[PDB]
Amino acid sequence: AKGQAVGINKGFITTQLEKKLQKHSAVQRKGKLGKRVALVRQVIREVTGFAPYEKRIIELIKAGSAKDSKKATKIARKRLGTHRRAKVKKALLEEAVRAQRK
Amino acid sequence: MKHNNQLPVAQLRKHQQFRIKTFFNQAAQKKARLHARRAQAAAVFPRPTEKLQPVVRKQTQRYNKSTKLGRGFTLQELKAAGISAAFAQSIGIKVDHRRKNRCQESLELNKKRLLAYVSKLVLFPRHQGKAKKGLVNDTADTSSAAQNALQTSVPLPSVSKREKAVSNIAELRKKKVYRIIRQEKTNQKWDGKRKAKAQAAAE
Amino acid sequence: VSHLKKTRKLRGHVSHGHGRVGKHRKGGCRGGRGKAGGMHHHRILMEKWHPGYYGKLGMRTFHLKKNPLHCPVVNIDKLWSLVSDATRQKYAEDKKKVPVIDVTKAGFFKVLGKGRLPNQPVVVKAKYFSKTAERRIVAVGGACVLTA
RNA sequence: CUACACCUGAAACAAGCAAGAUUACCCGCUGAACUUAAGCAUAUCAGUAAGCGGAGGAAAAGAAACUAACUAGGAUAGCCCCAGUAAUGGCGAAUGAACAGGCUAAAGCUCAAAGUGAAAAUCUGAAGUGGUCAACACAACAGAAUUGUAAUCUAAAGGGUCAACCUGAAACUAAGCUCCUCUCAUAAGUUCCUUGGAACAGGACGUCAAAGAGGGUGACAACCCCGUAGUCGGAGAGGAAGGCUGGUGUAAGGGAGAUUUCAAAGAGUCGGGUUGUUUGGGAUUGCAGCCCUAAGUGGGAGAUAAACUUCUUCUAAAGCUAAAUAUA
RNA sequence: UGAGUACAAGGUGCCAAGCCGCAAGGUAGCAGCAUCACCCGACCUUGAGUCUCCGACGAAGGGUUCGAGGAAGAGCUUAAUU
RNA sequence: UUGAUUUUGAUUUUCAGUAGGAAUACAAACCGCGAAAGCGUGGCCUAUCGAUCCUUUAACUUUACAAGUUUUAAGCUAGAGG
Ligand SMILES: [Mg+2]
Ligand SMILES: [Mg+2]
Ligand SMILES: [Mg+2]
Ligand SMILES: [Mg+2]
Ligand SMILES: [Mg+2]
Ligand SMILES: [Mg+2]
Ligand SMILES: [Mg+2]
Ligand SMILES: [Mg+2]
Ligand SMILES: [Mg+2]
Ligand SMILES: [Mg+2]
Ligand SMILES: [Mg+2]
Ligand SMILES: [Mg+2]
Ligand SMILES: [Mg+2]
Ligand SMILES: [Mg+2]
Ligand SMILES: [Mg+2]
Ligand SMILES: [Mg+2]
Ligand SMILES: [Mg+2]
Ligand SMILES: [Mg+2]
Ligand SMILES: [Mg+2]
Ligand SMILES: [Mg+2]
Ligand SMILES: [Mg+2]
Ligand SMILES: [Mg+2]
Ligand SMILES: [Mg+2]
Ligand SMILES: [Mg+2]
């Protein structure tokens, strides 16, 4: 109940604001990939090679079974901490594998 | 440890001898502050003492009902005023870049404030030349020589008198307030389990 | 101060009213310093004048924020005392429209009925109401309005 | 192989910098016991004494990887509150902050990172020339520097395209004020009696007072002398690690708003594990070793551990910064 | 959750003033004490009907119990003593 | 045949008229034995026993404090581990 305290809808009634009027931000643009970025990173990737743990995860991904996927995750989780960062690294590695097929 | 009196709460347990604070400076200090303020006026003479402050609601549920002086104006507000942060600053206006407007009314108050400010303003350019933005006011204003306080010139009134209507009583009487607040609190309470039920009966 | 204090009248009595046998001594006599031995030789004290001192109660709040818990209460009896006399009388005689009392502006949030109300009609704007608050308000010829 | 160039190291020489002192207040470390728990190990005393290393007139801190979830607030610091509260503790003794709100004080800025590439546009020294000659302005010649100086930029943006509207180093030229230091000057009884070694005492007659604060004069003196008051007054001398404000005004320099296939931001760091230590911070208070060791709408945070869905808030891993504050 | 029939703020035993009465006593009943009743909340128990019906609301009806509570507010600041 | 049971509270002994140990009298239950009245809240009566913190258990629309779902973690009442 919007006009009331305690409803599933926050109590108070406010005149909403326009899309034009809203706060201008920059800092909210954080995770952007500028093509410059992307390219540079790919360059150095080729210049670099994969890291041993990255390789392990890679083999596991190439196979593709449930066990293999699990191990990929486990390793990412274990070397990096943060089940999340694991998920992210899985993404990156897959991208390179997939793009390597072509 | 003898009688019925309330369990003591130790104070001087550590070595406080090193840690005592004395208030005699206070006397002179007040005075110093005075002269400082005064010497500010004299050195600032044509201009006002306190720079322009927008206003907002306070940060707590209990404080919402009240009004408080903000540190700065929202860029959104300077926009609707038509001032650049830089300019507003050359004017004596106080700007705050991390504050954001989530309400029309909060824009309104500060617009009203800004405009009020500008209207009452006098601007001294390099002698006898005139200018455009926020503009610049006539040489004769140099003679006008205003020493003014911001609360006098750019204030904010509210009176509590709540208007009465009967037709509405006839209306309002047909609902039940308690029942309302209850079913609402309830809804917030069980929302999660309920949505989960929707999701589960859907799959 | 000083000339009122016992010392002055004790000068020359040798024990300073601390006793010849038990004289005024250090912590040993206090029974140990502070809350010392509350649980032991001081059991009787603690138990008797501060019962329930030692132990634990129900639920830890790691960071307790009071501001959002803030809810001043008003009772029915003081309602008309909030707004001026002008008002309640002028609408005792005038039945055309009825009085609106905002508990909010007075710094209160929930309305509890405590006493009883004049038969003259009111509208009360408050954050919360008690079953009985609403009862008596409505029965008076009055109405409850929910604020935020 | 030589000459030569560049990288690396070395000697002597020129010009500059550090080395000790200071203690009250400040910074970074290191770090106990007496004591209290009526015993005593945890604890307390306490991040306290002693010890060490660094400063300054203050230091530190500071422009959010903050709060809060509200119709939100918004750098740092001090006061008041919150509070003796949440929390910590042989949950014993006893420890114990902060948000919101009232004030004082107010201030915001510089880098790294696509962009000179129509051209290193940059920095340092400099025989010298002008000068207020130690402090300023130019300067032949020399070094530094593309394993990169200066202009744009720092997310509150910004680049690109418009653009109302603005600005002013150079040179020339008038009048002024601020602050500091050392000096020089200013009312009115020494009338009369009595007691006194001494009158500054007790009497009689007088005066000045925006001066009757206080001193010294042989004694409890406004009026004898220094002073006090008019005096943020007047007069003279010298000052600024070389104080502050004008008028023309050059090459040149800005930009509200508007639009746009544009829009790029810190790594053995953040994060995790473990071990210590620390905090009220309690299965993620701060920090340090060791072991892991990232990401890129990523990354922090949202006072209970781990997933999963949604929302909120800020941009860390580079820097500067007056004031209110502390001074045995 | 909140001092539950809007027109309430009680009863009883002790008992003070005022008013009667020469006196005996009569009338009245402030504060306090004791007791019984009501009330809010904890813990139990019960429920027609109502709706934003899966969780809330509430006519009627209760407790062998619990509370640093209601029931015509008694506080707050200052000084002193123990 | 399991009344060596379910709720509470009170009372007596020691007594700071605190706790604890025992036992008693009630009011609510759910039962057993008896034709029934009745008797059973352990042993004919007077002894046979144990706090705070912690753990464990039983029972409960208690909480994790932007919002949720889990898993986990905290609670309230009461036993056992002393
Ligand atoms: Mg000072
Ligand atoms: Mg006395
Ligand atoms: Mg005596
Ligand atoms: Mg060399
Ligand atoms: Mg030194
Ligand atoms: Mg000591
Ligand atoms: Mg001792
Ligand atoms: Mg400590
Ligand atoms: Mg010095
Ligand atoms: Mg205090
Ligand atoms: Mg504040
Ligand atoms: Mg030279
Ligand atoms: Mg060169
Ligand atoms: Mg003589
Ligand atoms: Mg004389
Ligand atoms: Mg004198
Ligand atoms: Mg003078
Ligand atoms: Mg240490
Ligand atoms: Mg963690
Ligand atoms: Mg920083
Ligand atoms: Mg009564
Ligand atoms: Mg005994
Ligand atoms: Mg029976
Ligand atoms: Mg036990």
PDB file of all heavy atoms in Angstrom, chain D residues 12-22:
ATOM      1  P     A D  12      87.502   9.097  -5.624  1.00  0.00           P
ATOM      2  OP1   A D  12      88.122   8.799  -4.311  1.00  0.00           O
ATOM      3  OP2   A D  12      86.031   8.965  -5.764  1.00  0.00           O
ATOM      4  O5'   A D  12      87.980  10.531  -6.141  1.00  0.00           O
ATOM      5  C5'   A D  12      89.362  10.820  -6.335  1.00  0.00           C
ATOM      6  C4'   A D  12      89.566  11.896  -7.376  1.00  0.00           C
ATOM      7  O4'   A D  12      89.165  11.401  -8.680  1.00  0.00           O
ATOM      8  C3'   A D  12      88.747  13.166  -7.194  1.00  0.00           C
ATOM      9  O3'   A D  12      89.330  14.077  -6.284  1.00  0.00           O
ATOM     10  C2'   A D  12      88.637  13.708  -8.614  1.00  0.00           C
ATOM     11  O2'   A D  12      89.841  14.358  -9.008  1.00  0.00           O
ATOM     12  C1'   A D  12      88.508  12.418  -9.408  1.00  0.00           C
ATOM     13  N9    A D  12      87.102  12.022  -9.577  1.00  0.00           N
ATOM     14  C8    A D  12      86.409  11.113  -8.831  1.00  0.00           C
ATOM     15  N7    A D  12      85.170  10.951  -9.211  1.00  0.00           N
ATOM     16  C5    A D  12      85.039  11.818 -10.278  1.00  0.00           C
ATOM     17  C6    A D  12      83.960  12.116 -11.118  1.00  0.00           C
ATOM     18  N6    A D  12      82.748  11.561 -11.029  1.00  0.00           N
ATOM     19  N1    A D  12      84.177  13.029 -12.080  1.00  0.00           N
ATOM     20  C2    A D  12      85.387  13.594 -12.179  1.00  0.00           C
ATOM     21  N3    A D  12      86.479  13.397 -11.452  1.00  0.00           N
ATOM     22  C4    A D  12      86.227  12.484 -10.511  1.00  0.00           C
ATOM     23  P     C D  13      88.394  15.001  -5.371  1.00  0.00           P
ATOM     24  OP1   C D  13      89.268  15.640  -4.360  1.00  0.00           O
ATOM     25  OP2   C D  13      87.269  14.156  -4.913  1.00  0.00           O
ATOM     26  O5'   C D  13      87.860  16.093  -6.397  1.00  0.00           O
ATOM     27  C5'   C D  13      88.750  16.972  -7.069  1.00  0.00           C
ATOM     28  C4'   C D  13      88.038  17.740  -8.155  1.00  0.00           C
ATOM     29  O4'   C D  13      87.557  16.814  -9.163  1.00  0.00           O
ATOM     30  C3'   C D  13      86.790  18.490  -7.721  1.00  0.00           C
ATOM     31  O3'   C D  13      87.074  19.746  -7.131  1.00  0.00           O
ATOM     32  C2'   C D  13      85.986  18.586  -9.007  1.00  0.00           C
ATOM     33  O2'   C D  13      86.481  19.631  -9.829  1.00  0.00           O
ATOM     34  C1'   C D  13      86.317  17.251  -9.672  1.00  0.00           C
ATOM     35  N1    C D  13      85.303  16.216  -9.387  1.00  0.00           N
ATOM     36  C2    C D  13      84.092  16.241 -10.076  1.00  0.00           C
ATOM     37  O2    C D  13      83.888  17.133 -10.904  1.00  0.00           O
ATOM     38  N3    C D  13      83.160  15.305  -9.828  1.00  0.00           N
ATOM     39  C4    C D  13      83.419  14.364  -8.934  1.00  0.00           C
ATOM     40  N4    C D  13      82.464  13.463  -8.726  1.00  0.00           N
ATOM     41  C5    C D  13      84.647  14.297  -8.216  1.00  0.00           C
ATOM     42  C6    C D  13      85.559  15.239  -8.474  1.00  0.00           C
ATOM     43  P     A D  14      85.948  20.500  -6.269  1.00  0.00           P
ATOM     44  OP1   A D  14      86.584  21.694  -5.672  1.00  0.00           O
ATOM     45  OP2   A D  14      85.339  19.489  -5.372  1.00  0.00           O
ATOM     46  O5'   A D  14      84.891  20.947  -7.374  1.00  0.00           O
ATOM     47  C5'   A D  14      85.101  22.113  -8.163  1.00  0.00           C
ATOM     48  C4'   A D  14      83.808  22.619  -8.760  1.00  0.00           C
ATOM     49  O4'   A D  14      83.299  21.657  -9.713  1.00  0.00           O
ATOM     50  C3'   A D  14      82.666  22.832  -7.778  1.00  0.00           C
ATOM     51  O3'   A D  14      82.692  24.117  -7.193  1.00  0.00           O
ATOM     52  C2'   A D  14      81.423  22.577  -8.613  1.00  0.00           C
ATOM     53  O2'   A D  14      81.089  23.723  -9.373  1.00  0.00           O
ATOM     54  C1'   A D  14      81.910  21.505  -9.568  1.00  0.00           C
ATOM     55  N9    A D  14      81.655  20.156  -9.053  1.00  0.00           N
ATOM     56  C8    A D  14      82.569  19.335  -8.436  1.00  0.00           C
ATOM     57  N7    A D  14      82.078  18.162  -8.099  1.00  0.00           N
ATOM     58  C5    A D  14      80.753  18.220  -8.536  1.00  0.00           C
ATOM     59  C6    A D  14      79.696  17.287  -8.475  1.00  0.00           C
ATOM     60  N6    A D  14      79.820  16.073  -7.927  1.00  0.00           N
ATOM     61  N1    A D  14      78.506  17.657  -9.001  1.00  0.00           N
ATOM     62  C2    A D  14      78.398  18.876  -9.548  1.00  0.00           C
ATOM     63  N3    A D  14      79.315  19.843  -9.664  1.00  0.00           N
ATOM     64  C4    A D  14      80.484  19.445  -9.132  1.00  0.00           C
ATOM     65  P     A D  15      82.103  24.340  -5.729  1.00  0.00           P
ATOM     66  OP1   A D  15      82.512  25.696  -5.298  1.00  0.00           O
ATOM     67  OP2   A D  15      82.523  23.177  -4.911  1.00  0.00           O
ATOM     68  O5'   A D  15      80.538  24.286  -5.976  1.00  0.00           O
ATOM     69  C5'   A D  15      79.923  25.165  -6.896  1.00  0.00           C
ATOM     70  C4'   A D  15      78.500  24.768  -7.172  1.00  0.00           C
ATOM     71  O4'   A D  15      78.464  23.464  -7.793  1.00  0.00           O
ATOM     72  C3'   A D  15      77.595  24.628  -5.960  1.00  0.00           C
ATOM     73  O3'   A D  15      77.095  25.878  -5.514  1.00  0.00           O
ATOM     74  C2'   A D  15      76.505  23.684  -6.459  1.00  0.00           C
ATOM     75  O2'   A D  15      75.521  24.400  -7.185  1.00  0.00           O
ATOM     76  C1'   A D  15      77.275  22.796  -7.442  1.00  0.00           C
ATOM     77  N9    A D  15      77.624  21.475  -6.875  1.00  0.00           N
ATOM     78  C8    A D  15      78.777  21.136  -6.207  1.00  0.00           C
ATOM     79  N7    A D  15      78.833  19.877  -5.832  1.00  0.00           N
ATOM     80  C5    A D  15      77.644  19.337  -6.299  1.00  0.00           C
ATOM     81  C6    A D  15      77.106  18.043  -6.225  1.00  0.00           C
ATOM     82  N6    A D  15      77.718  17.020  -5.630  1.00  0.00           N
ATOM     83  N1    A D  15      75.904  17.822  -6.787  1.00  0.00           N
ATOM     84  C2    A D  15      75.295  18.849  -7.380  1.00  0.00           C
ATOM     85  N3    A D  15      75.695  20.111  -7.513  1.00  0.00           N
ATOM     86  C4    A D  15      76.896  20.301  -6.947  1.00  0.00           C
ATOM     87  P     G D  16      76.648  26.091  -3.984  1.00  0.00           P
ATOM     88  OP1   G D  16      75.544  27.080  -3.985  1.00  0.00           O
ATOM     89  OP2   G D  16      77.874  26.396  -3.208  1.00  0.00           O
ATOM     90  O5'   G D  16      76.093  24.665  -3.576  1.00  0.00           O
ATOM     91  C5'   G D  16      74.980  24.542  -2.715  1.00  0.00           C
ATOM     92  C4'   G D  16      73.947  23.615  -3.289  1.00  0.00           C
ATOM     93  O4'   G D  16      74.588  22.607  -4.095  1.00  0.00           O
ATOM     94  C3'   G D  16      73.147  22.821  -2.283  1.00  0.00           C
ATOM     95  O3'   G D  16      72.087  23.567  -1.731  1.00  0.00           O
ATOM     96  C2'   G D  16      72.691  21.599  -3.079  1.00  0.00           C
ATOM     97  O2'   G D  16      71.531  21.894  -3.842  1.00  0.00           O
ATOM     98  C1'   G D  16      73.852  21.403  -4.041  1.00  0.00           C
ATOM     99  N9    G D  16      74.749  20.308  -3.635  1.00  0.00           N
ATOM    100  C8    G D  16      76.067  20.412  -3.278  1.00  0.00           C
ATOM    101  N7    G D  16      76.625  19.265  -3.007  1.00  0.00           N
ATOM    102  C5    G D  16      75.613  18.341  -3.205  1.00  0.00           C
ATOM    103  C6    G D  16      75.625  16.929  -3.059  1.00  0.00           C
ATOM    104  O6    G D  16      76.554  16.194  -2.716  1.00  0.00           O
ATOM    105  N1    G D  16      74.392  16.374  -3.358  1.00  0.00           N
ATOM    106  C2    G D  16      73.289  17.097  -3.747  1.00  0.00           C
ATOM    107  N2    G D  16      72.176  16.390  -3.996  1.00  0.00           N
ATOM    108  N3    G D  16      73.262  18.415  -3.888  1.00  0.00           N
ATOM    109  C4    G D  16      74.453  18.970  -3.603  1.00  0.00           C
ATOM    110  P     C D  17      71.649  23.337  -0.209  1.00  0.00           P
ATOM    111  OP1   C D  17      70.361  24.050  -0.022  1.00  0.00           O
ATOM    112  OP2   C D  17      72.811  23.715   0.636  1.00  0.00           O
ATOM    113  O5'   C D  17      71.423  21.760  -0.143  1.00  0.00           O
ATOM    114  C5'   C D  17      70.650  21.168   0.888  1.00  0.00           C
ATOM    115  C4'   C D  17      70.182  19.796   0.488  1.00  0.00           C
ATOM    116  O4'   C D  17      70.987  19.325  -0.619  1.00  0.00           O
ATOM    117  C3'   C D  17      70.325  18.712   1.540  1.00  0.00           C
ATOM    118  O3'   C D  17      69.255  18.693   2.463  1.00  0.00           O
ATOM    119  C2'   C D  17      70.451  17.440   0.705  1.00  0.00           C
ATOM    120  O2'   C D  17      69.182  17.010   0.229  1.00  0.00           O
ATOM    121  C1'   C D  17      71.258  17.949  -0.480  1.00  0.00           C
ATOM    122  N1    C D  17      72.703  17.789  -0.268  1.00  0.00           N
ATOM    123  C2    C D  17      73.264  16.509  -0.239  1.00  0.00           C
ATOM    124  O2    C D  17      72.504  15.540  -0.392  1.00  0.00           O
ATOM    125  N3    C D  17      74.600  16.364  -0.041  1.00  0.00           N
ATOM    126  C4    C D  17      75.352  17.451   0.123  1.00  0.00           C
ATOM    127  N4    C D  17      76.663  17.282   0.314  1.00  0.00           N
ATOM    128  C5    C D  17      74.795  18.769   0.095  1.00  0.00           C
ATOM    129  C6    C D  17      73.478  18.899  -0.101  1.00  0.00           C
ATOM    130  P     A D  18      69.522  19.042   4.005  1.00  0.00           P
ATOM    131  OP1   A D  18      68.270  19.613   4.544  1.00  0.00           O
ATOM    132  OP2   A D  18      70.760  19.863   4.059  1.00  0.00           O
ATOM    133  O5'   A D  18      69.791  17.604   4.654  1.00  0.00           O
ATOM    134  C5'   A D  18      68.744  16.649   4.807  1.00  0.00           C
ATOM    135  C4'   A D  18      69.294  15.257   5.009  1.00  0.00           C
ATOM    136  O4'   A D  18      70.292  14.990   4.004  1.00  0.00           O
ATOM    137  C3'   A D  18      70.012  15.009   6.328  1.00  0.00           C
ATOM    138  O3'   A D  18      69.125  14.652   7.366  1.00  0.00           O
ATOM    139  C2'   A D  18      70.998  13.903   5.990  1.00  0.00           C
ATOM    140  O2'   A D  18      70.363  12.639   6.047  1.00  0.00           O
ATOM    141  C1'   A D  18      71.329  14.203   4.538  1.00  0.00           C
ATOM    142  N9    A D  18      72.608  14.922   4.379  1.00  0.00           N
ATOM    143  C8    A D  18      72.818  16.270   4.259  1.00  0.00           C
ATOM    144  N7    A D  18      74.080  16.595   4.097  1.00  0.00           N
ATOM    145  C5    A D  18      74.746  15.378   4.093  1.00  0.00           C
ATOM    146  C6    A D  18      76.101  15.042   3.960  1.00  0.00           C
ATOM    147  N6    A D  18      77.057  15.957   3.799  1.00  0.00           N
ATOM    148  N1    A D  18      76.437  13.733   4.005  1.00  0.00           N
ATOM    149  C2    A D  18      75.461  12.831   4.174  1.00  0.00           C
ATOM    150  N3    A D  18      74.151  13.027   4.309  1.00  0.00           N
ATOM    151  C4    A D  18      73.852  14.339   4.259  1.00  0.00           C
ATOM    152  P     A D  19      69.230  15.351   8.797  1.00  0.00           P
ATOM    153  OP1   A D  19      68.075  14.876   9.593  1.00  0.00           O
ATOM    154  OP2   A D  19      69.384  16.797   8.563  1.00  0.00           O
ATOM    155  O5'   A D  19      70.573  14.756   9.391  1.00  0.00           O
ATOM    156  C5'   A D  19      70.545  13.920  10.533  1.00  0.00           C
ATOM    157  C4'   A D  19      71.704  12.987  10.522  1.00  0.00           C
ATOM    158  O4'   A D  19      72.237  12.967   9.184  1.00  0.00           O
ATOM    159  C3'   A D  19      72.890  13.402  11.383  1.00  0.00           C
ATOM    160  O3'   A D  19      72.803  13.007  12.744  1.00  0.00           O
ATOM    161  C2'   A D  19      74.072  12.806  10.651  1.00  0.00           C
ATOM    162  O2'   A D  19      74.155  11.399  10.873  1.00  0.00           O
ATOM    163  C1'   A D  19      73.642  13.044   9.220  1.00  0.00           C
ATOM    164  N9    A D  19      74.028  14.379   8.758  1.00  0.00           N
ATOM    165  C8    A D  19      73.251  15.497   8.807  1.00  0.00           C
ATOM    166  N7    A D  19      73.855  16.539   8.298  1.00  0.00           N
ATOM    167  C5    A D  19      75.100  16.062   7.887  1.00  0.00           C
ATOM    168  C6    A D  19      76.211  16.674   7.268  1.00  0.00           C
ATOM    169  N6    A D  19      76.260  17.967   6.936  1.00  0.00           N
ATOM    170  N1    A D  19      77.292  15.911   6.997  1.00  0.00           N
ATOM    171  C2    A D  19      77.254  14.615   7.329  1.00  0.00           C
ATOM    172  N3    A D  19      76.280  13.918   7.911  1.00  0.00           N
ATOM    173  C4    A D  19      75.219  14.716   8.164  1.00  0.00           C
ATOM    174  P     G D  20      71.987  11.694  13.224  1.00  0.00           P
ATOM    175  OP1   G D  20      72.873  10.519  13.069  1.00  0.00           O
ATOM    176  OP2   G D  20      70.683  11.688  12.524  1.00  0.00           O
ATOM    177  O5'   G D  20      71.774  12.020  14.782  1.00  0.00           O
ATOM    178  C5'   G D  20      72.884  12.076  15.689  1.00  0.00           C
ATOM    179  C4'   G D  20      73.220  13.491  16.151  1.00  0.00           C
ATOM    180  O4'   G D  20      73.261  14.414  15.030  1.00  0.00           O
ATOM    181  C3'   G D  20      72.251  14.163  17.095  1.00  0.00           C
ATOM    182  O3'   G D  20      72.301  13.655  18.405  1.00  0.00           O
ATOM    183  C2'   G D  20      72.698  15.606  16.986  1.00  0.00           C
ATOM    184  O2'   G D  20      73.961  15.777  17.606  1.00  0.00           O
ATOM    185  C1'   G D  20      72.894  15.710  15.483  1.00  0.00           C
ATOM    186  N9    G D  20      71.640  16.095  14.833  1.00  0.00           N
ATOM    187  C8    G D  20      70.820  15.289  14.100  1.00  0.00           C
ATOM    188  N7    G D  20      69.753  15.912  13.700  1.00  0.00           N
ATOM    189  C5    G D  20      69.874  17.195  14.219  1.00  0.00           C
ATOM    190  C6    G D  20      69.004  18.314  14.122  1.00  0.00           C
ATOM    191  O6    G D  20      67.928  18.385  13.528  1.00  0.00           O
ATOM    192  N1    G D  20      69.487  19.425  14.801  1.00  0.00           N
ATOM    193  C2    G D  20      70.664  19.447  15.489  1.00  0.00           C
ATOM    194  N2    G D  20      70.957  20.610  16.077  1.00  0.00           N
ATOM    195  N3    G D  20      71.490  18.412  15.595  1.00  0.00           N
ATOM    196  C4    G D  20      71.035  17.323  14.939  1.00  0.00           C
ATOM    197  P     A D  21      70.962  13.608  19.276  1.00  0.00           P
ATOM    198  OP1   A D  21      71.325  13.048  20.598  1.00  0.00           O
ATOM    199  OP2   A D  21      69.941  12.901  18.465  1.00  0.00           O
ATOM    200  O5'   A D  21      70.572  15.160  19.406  1.00  0.00           O
ATOM    201  C5'   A D  21      71.451  16.091  20.028  1.00  0.00           C
ATOM    202  C4'   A D  21      70.791  17.435  20.240  1.00  0.00           C
ATOM    203  O4'   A D  21      70.607  18.093  18.965  1.00  0.00           O
ATOM    204  C3'   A D  21      69.403  17.412  20.870  1.00  0.00           C
ATOM    205  O3'   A D  21      69.448  17.342  22.284  1.00  0.00           O
ATOM    206  C2'   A D  21      68.750  18.688  20.331  1.00  0.00           C
ATOM    207  O2'   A D  21      69.121  19.829  21.098  1.00  0.00           O
ATOM    208  C1'   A D  21      69.388  18.798  18.943  1.00  0.00           C
ATOM    209  N9    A D  21      68.551  18.196  17.906  1.00  0.00           N
ATOM    210  C8    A D  21      68.883  17.119  17.147  1.00  0.00           C
ATOM    211  N7    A D  21      67.950  16.802  16.297  1.00  0.00           N
ATOM    212  C5    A D  21      66.948  17.727  16.510  1.00  0.00           C
ATOM    213  C6    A D  21      65.688  17.911  15.913  1.00  0.00           C
ATOM    214  N6    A D  21      65.209  17.144  14.933  1.00  0.00           N
ATOM    215  N1    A D  21      64.920  18.924  16.357  1.00  0.00           N
ATOM    216  C2    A D  21      65.426  19.688  17.340  1.00  0.00           C
ATOM    217  N3    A D  21      66.594  19.624  17.986  1.00  0.00           N
ATOM    218  C4    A D  21      67.313  18.601  17.506  1.00  0.00           C
ATOM    219  P     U D  22      68.163  16.866  23.112  1.00  0.00           P
ATOM    220  OP1   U D  22      68.424  17.189  24.541  1.00  0.00           O
ATOM    221  OP2   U D  22      67.891  15.469  22.746  1.00  0.00           O
ATOM    222  O5'   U D  22      67.013  17.806  22.546  1.00  0.00           O
ATOM    223  C5'   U D  22      66.812  19.117  23.065  1.00  0.00           C
ATOM    224  C4'   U D  22      65.536  19.721  22.533  1.00  0.00           C
ATOM    225  O4'   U D  22      65.555  19.694  21.083  1.00  0.00           O
ATOM    226  C3'   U D  22      64.248  18.990  22.901  1.00  0.00           C
ATOM    227  O3'   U D  22      63.756  19.347  24.176  1.00  0.00           O
ATOM    228  C2'   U D  22      63.302  19.368  21.767  1.00  0.00           C
ATOM    229  O2'   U D  22      62.751  20.655  21.979  1.00  0.00           O
ATOM    230  C1'   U D  22      64.253  19.453  20.584  1.00  0.00           C
ATOM    231  N1    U D  22      64.262  18.208  19.770  1.00  0.00           N
ATOM    232  C2    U D  22      63.145  17.921  18.986  1.00  0.00           C
ATOM    233  O2    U D  22      62.128  18.605  18.940  1.00  0.00           O
ATOM    234  N3    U D  22      63.246  16.777  18.248  1.00  0.00           N
ATOM    235  C4    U D  22      64.314  15.920  18.203  1.00  0.00           C
ATOM    236  O4    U D  22      64.252  14.931  17.487  1.00  0.00           O
ATOM    237  C5    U D  22      65.424  16.280  19.015  1.00  0.00           C
ATOM    238  C6    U D  22      65.362  17.385  19.758  1.00  0.00           C
TER     239        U D  22
END
